Design a protein around this ligand. Structure first.
Ligand code: BOG
Ligand code: BOG
Ligand code: ISC
Ligand code: ISC
Lengths: 207, 207
């Protein structure tokens, strides 16, 4: 009862297909965190292999640049086997959710965390919710957030909104996210570019 | 430089045009708060009069039922004349924002707050952000939230998401909200019904 629908293959958007950004922010490595959002085996299994492959190749490219440039890396991941109390109203849309087993909860090996990277717990749509993401960013002097991962219109977008709300400038990497469908993905970008982030492609980040 | 686009008249959705709810929550007055979200003069002036009139008539109907049934009423409102620091990244999409003058910041008279109603400050998209909404709901023993107001896809939706995330069951009143366009409004409902709320009409609440 995952609540996650059948996902049909679609192309990741190119720079030419992105909506116009209304903001004018510019990414500075020294100010930034890369949020690798919910790239757990359980959340990537629903993706068709072509989409999975495109997503993980770009996120990996992105992560390597970030490490080379001194961008702080952060992963969010659900603990798995949430208690009823922990699960709360996620139950109603998404069932009991993934198990606390390596097969479900592991970050996929192509994005394997390194010793210096932050490991944050995901409870709800926003990566900041009941995590110490905000506190860590403040204590690290980092006020920009680069987002990649899944699902574009759900946790990725809501995390973007929350960062924005905390006066943290977000950069949503349009082809290093994936979603339930092309339309969901496109609408997440449209929302971001006009309401809370700079929408960019992986190449655009790498310059 | 409000950032608010020209809004063209459109009909509020009827029960038959609503997306299917995936949740099964049921509103109990004793558990609930009615959030009258950003119904300030400044935010309603961009609406064409037909849309304004439909919105305020349904919100008023809703508020009267809520009072008759013992539902706690709460208003959110921006202080106006935000400092640069207070305004933060809202500046980039929405300019300096409304003034701290009655002409901008007042709740519209058709929804005039009463002495028992909560007055909460709005800073960002989510009504909970830097307000004491959550704290008050917890201390009042209320764990359901009925939302009306503007703009459907921005603060109304993000507030709905935040309530949901705090295991507070939301009820989004589809024809007691308004938005930048019909498509924005419809997509907010689609999002809500499948991700964070029961979507209902004013009549459906009044039974
Ligand atoms: C910016 C993001 C915009 C998303 C607009 C609608 C998002 C919710 O879309 C929902 O997806 C479900 C499949 O998961 C469908 O079954 C629902 O009918 C549909 O409304
Ligand atoms: C669930 C809510 C879905 C909204 C999908 C897109 C929302 C943002 O829509 C934006 O509205 C602007 C006018 O304000 C347009 O100028 C932008 O081009 C458009 O992308
Ligand atoms: C990958 C996300 O997880 C959520 C979305 C679908 C299923 C979930 C679950 O089973 O818990 C999440 O709540 C995200 O927030 O985008
Ligand atoms: C009515 C809202 O205010 C926001 C939306 C547009 C302009 C705003 C402003 O000028 O501050 C808000 O940030 C809402 O969150 O939906």
């Amino acid at each position: 009862m995952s609540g996650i629908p059948e996902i049909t293959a679609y192309p990741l958007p190119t720079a030419q297909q992105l909506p116009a950004n209304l903001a004018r922010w510019s990414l500075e490595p020294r100010r930034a965190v890369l949020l690798v959002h919910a790239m757990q085996r359980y959340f990537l299994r629903p993706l068709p292999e072509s989409l999975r492959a495109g997503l993980v190749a770009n996120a990996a490219r992105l992560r390597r640049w970030c490490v080379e440039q001194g961008v702080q890396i952060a992963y969010t991941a659900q603990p798995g086997s949430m208690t009823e109390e922990q699960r709360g109203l996620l139950k109603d849309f998404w069932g009991p959710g993934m198990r606390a087993s390596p097969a479900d909860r592991e970050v996929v090996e192509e994005l394997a965390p390194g010793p210096d990277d932050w490991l944050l717990t995901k409870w709800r749509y926003s990566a900041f919710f009941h995590s110490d993401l905000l506190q860590r960013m403040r204590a690290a002097g980092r006020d920009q957030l680069v987002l990649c991962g899944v699902y574009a219109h759900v946790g990725v977008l809501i995390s973007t909104v929350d960062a924005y709300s905390n006066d943290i400038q977000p950069f949503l990497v349009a082809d290093a996210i994936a979603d339930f469908s092309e339309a969901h993905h496109r609408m997440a970008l449209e929302y971001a570019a006009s309401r809370c982030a700079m929408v960019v492609t992986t190449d655009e980040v790498l310059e």
